[PDB]
Scaffold this active site. Sequence first.
Site, short mmCIF file in Angstrom:
data_model
loop_
_atom_site.label_atom_id
_atom_site.label_comp_id
_atom_site.label_asym_id
_atom_site.label_seq_id
_atom_site.Cartn_x
_atom_site.Cartn_y
_atom_site.Cartn_z
N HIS A 228 0.80 -1.24 0.00
CA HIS A 228 0.00 0.00 0.00
C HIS A 228 0.83 1.28 0.00
O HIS A 228 0.27 2.38 0.13
CB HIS A 228 -1.02 0.02 1.15
N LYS B 230 3.15 3.89 -2.04
CA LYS B 230 3.39 4.33 -3.42
C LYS B 230 4.88 4.27 -3.73
O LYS B 230 5.73 4.57 -2.87
CB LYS B 230 2.83 5.74 -3.65
N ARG C 251 -3.34 17.06 4.05
CA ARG C 251 -1.97 17.57 3.95
C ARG C 251 -1.55 17.78 2.48
O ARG C 251 -2.23 17.31 1.56
CB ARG C 251 -1.04 16.57 4.62
N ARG D 111 10.11 7.48 -6.29
CA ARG D 111 10.60 7.63 -4.92
C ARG D 111 11.92 6.89 -4.75
O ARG D 111 12.04 5.72 -5.13
CB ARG D 111 9.60 7.06 -3.92
#
Length: 446
Positions: A236, A238, A292, A338
């Site tokens: 879960h 990313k 956020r 990432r």
Amino acid sequence: MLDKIVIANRGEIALRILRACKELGIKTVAVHSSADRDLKHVLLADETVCIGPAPSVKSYLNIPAIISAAEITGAVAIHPGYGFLSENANFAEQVERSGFIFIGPKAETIRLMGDKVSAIAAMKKAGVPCVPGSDGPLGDDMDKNRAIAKRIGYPVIIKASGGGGGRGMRVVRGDAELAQSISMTRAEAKAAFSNDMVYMEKYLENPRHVEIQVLADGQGNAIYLAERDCSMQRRHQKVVEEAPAPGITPELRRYIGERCAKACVDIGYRGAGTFEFLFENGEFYFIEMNTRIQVEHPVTEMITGVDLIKEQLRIAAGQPLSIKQEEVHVRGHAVECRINAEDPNTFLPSPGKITRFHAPGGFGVRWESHIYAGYTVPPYYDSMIGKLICYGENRDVAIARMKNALQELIIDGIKTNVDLQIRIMNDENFQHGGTNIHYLEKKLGL
Ligand SMILES: Nc1nccc(-c2csc(N)n2)n1
Ligand SMILES: [Cl-]
């Protein structure tokens, strides 16, 4: 404009916020743990305050310490970034009670979105499409619970109301597993959140994760800044995000975007926010809202030209949004990979000292990271150490540039996921686009 702000975060996002502040002439206060004295943003900040030892409970989650730092430095606002206290309504409440500006929505709005059942009710009322579900918390009457399951139709999924991010859920494919699935989800939510409320949704087998970026000011303006696909995930979490989402037409974009902006008006939303949807068979279904700014915000910036952090700061100061909806245009395509300090075989965090570092450059290449040669990645925080974002005139160019930029990226001394990211960019199904939320784990055989 806000005179001075506390950046209540660390790592790449703290540096991101610092740059935005510097551009706007806003003085910066970098609060940091004793392990983070040599963070790049700390070294660049106008003032620094050590707020406690390394463990986050005594530093980045230490509410009194952070508020005290704001008081002693004469700061007027606190930016929570993402993670840590950014979705903590009690923190937001205390910040405002203490007389400082919380860079985010009103605390009541944070609390509404942190309650998944209440959030869904609000979105459904506002006209946002949601997953067929219980439209309320499940009780202890298993006759009633079986009836709800029958009405939705198996398979279903049990989710914790006080949860988020796909955590602690269980899929139920028939009556025989329903009671135990409800009980276990309840127990895990109670142990994690001291909130045992659960709900039920239709289980979508192979959806994509598509989320809509919004901004709302205190003047009643609310806009949507297209979408991001974040389907490439592990547990879960990313791994790759992109904007726009492949296959989403201008008409679909408009349809769902308008409904999200309308919802913002209805609920009195303020600041940046993200509406998360499951997208399957050409249909959107709302699952949750993050109040956020998020990790993956840069892909939206690349394709719209809007600086989302600067907008957050403008909004908090009482300025209206710098752009109108008719001025927002999707141009080109952006991909974010990432970069994590992790072991490639275990996927456990891999902290340590970086011995050689080199960042990629060039047209359309954006590197978001606090790391530098000789920097030590501490063991106490998240594994994500940077983000590589590439923009092109179309999706293929963005992917090509990412491939090249990943090859230039040097991070020696610690294990990273650069090689995995290279593999994903070279994946034929990713190259085609529109892979679902289960794809990466299937590819890897996890
Ligand atoms: N309703 C439904 N169906 C399939 C997947 C999900 C899901 C995955 S992660 C999350 N928050 N929700 N939710
Ligand atoms: Cl995030």
